[PDB]
Amino acid sequence: KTRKLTNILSKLIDKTMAGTSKITDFTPGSASRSLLEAVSLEIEQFYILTKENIDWGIQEGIIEAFDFQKRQSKRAYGDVTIQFYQPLDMRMYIPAGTTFTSTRQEYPQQFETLVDYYAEPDSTEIVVEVYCKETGVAGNVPEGTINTIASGSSLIRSVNNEYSFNTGTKEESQEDFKRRFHSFVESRGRATNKSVRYGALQIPDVEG
Amino acid sequence: MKTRKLTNILSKLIDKTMAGTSKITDFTPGSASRSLLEAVSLEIEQFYILTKENIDWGIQEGIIEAFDFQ
């Protein structure tokens, strides 16, 4: 299915020797062996990329066509508004990794920025996205909970997230997905004892 | 994602290679550059073929996994 480093490199040296008589040295440091090694290693990377992509297709692709989407763990994220004491006079710099903490005693959550943002001199109010330092639902927080920035730049007056973060989805194994899909597929049977029995359950007063 | 036979790859490769200079156009079998480029195109051809086979095997495996019809 997939080849290895040596399995490709050796075949490449064999073909090189067979095609031409002009090359006979394959020691360390030869530009040819170097080129061949870089080629082999690139090809192994593509082979592993193909393997991972086929693995993902086996896991999710065949069932996703029926509109059923799998829940994938991701960092909580959302829009955060920063207010300044006065209108800026010079372009301000906000590095990635600018860190965020909640002064509320019931919320020890923390966020950080992934990419660099800049505030233009003419601007006075800037919206910057932030990402939680922890995965899952731990990142979730109600509106107005940060109230602070770690970079201590005295131009900033107050900070607050306009909307609650709810994108910190939990991790669910494919067993439950497969179970629910199979249950949906079995419920479509017609003219069967078990299906008829299942269909009698829809009425709330039909129990026994 | 489609097959590309060795000679198709090799031709595209040499065609690109000749852009910007004309001190390479000699590709007899004895040439070493031809041998290297034949070997690279051989490996790319094998990569495409194994990719297509592995795709088919992945399709089969997903069909196994989805309905549990081992």
Binding site: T6, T24, T27 | -
Partner: protein
């Protein structure tokens, strides 16, 4: 160098291996009082009735031994002001770092480089079995004397055993055998049984640096693939 005709001699220096990459060195402020080098030979001579038999088996270990002290005056250093006592303490700590975690844990360096600028000689050395010996005496109330014995791994100009590159002309990996084994792995049980039987049948009736250019070493390897893929019998032969 010495003190004679040429400019001032350079003292003896010791190079140790830094844990964190790179190297650290140690130069003696005071040249050793005694410096002995033993270079024996491994050869034995045994006379017969009317002749003498001499046999030899190479050069023996060249044992280096020397004795030195440390001066009481301070002297400038590369960093700080270190007196003789500190110098000898640092030497002790270095030897103990090379020796105490040698058999246990791990040491980055495999050997020690011993530089004799005064004698214009260089060698790669390892701690002897006698090992370091420090002693302080009545008639040297302020000083500290050290006695060390060493065994020469080899000349410093040569390269390390593990860092040697052979000729390696042509392909080193026989890819024919590799693909033969890969193809044999997929074969069915009957195919493998028939290949064993065919191998036995050929066997019982016999007597009656891979490079295809300028060599015939990789002959049967190419046949094995070709016989497997094409199919000589159910499994193959050889």
């Amino acid at each position: 160098p010495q003190s004679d005709g040429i400019s001032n001699l350079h003292r003896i220096a010791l190079r140790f291996p830094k844990e964190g990459g790179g190297y650290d060195m140690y130069r003696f402020k005071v040249n050793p009082e005694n410096y002995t080098i033993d270079s024996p030979q491994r050869t034995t001579a045994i006379k017969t009735k009317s002749d003498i038999v001499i046999e030899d088996y190479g050069k023996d270990i060249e044992v280096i031994n020397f004795t030195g002290t440390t001066g009481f005056r301070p002297v400038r250093e590369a960093d700080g002001l270190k007196t003789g006592k500190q110098k000898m303490e640092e030497l002790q700590s270095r030897v103990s770092e090379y020796a105490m975690q040698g058999g246990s844990g791990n040491v980055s360096g495999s050997y020690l480089q011993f530089f004799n600028f005064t004698d214009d000689s260089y060698y790669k050395v390892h701690l002897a079995p006698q090992g370091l010996k420090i002693t302080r005496s009545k008639d040297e109330p302020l000083l500290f004397r050290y006695e060390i014995t060493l065994v020469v791994i080899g000349s410093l100009t040569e390269a390390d055993r593990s860092a040697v590159t052979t000729e390696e002309f042509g392909n080193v990996k026989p890819n024919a055998s590799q693909r033969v084994d890969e193809g044999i792995k997929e074969l069915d049980k009957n195919a493998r049984k028939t290949r064993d039987r065919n191998n036995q049948e050929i066997s019982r009736r016999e007597n009656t640096i891979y490079n295809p250019r300028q060599s015939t070493n990789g002959l049967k390897g190419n046949i094995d693939n070709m016989a497997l893929i094409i199919g000589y019998g159910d499994g193959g032969v050889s």
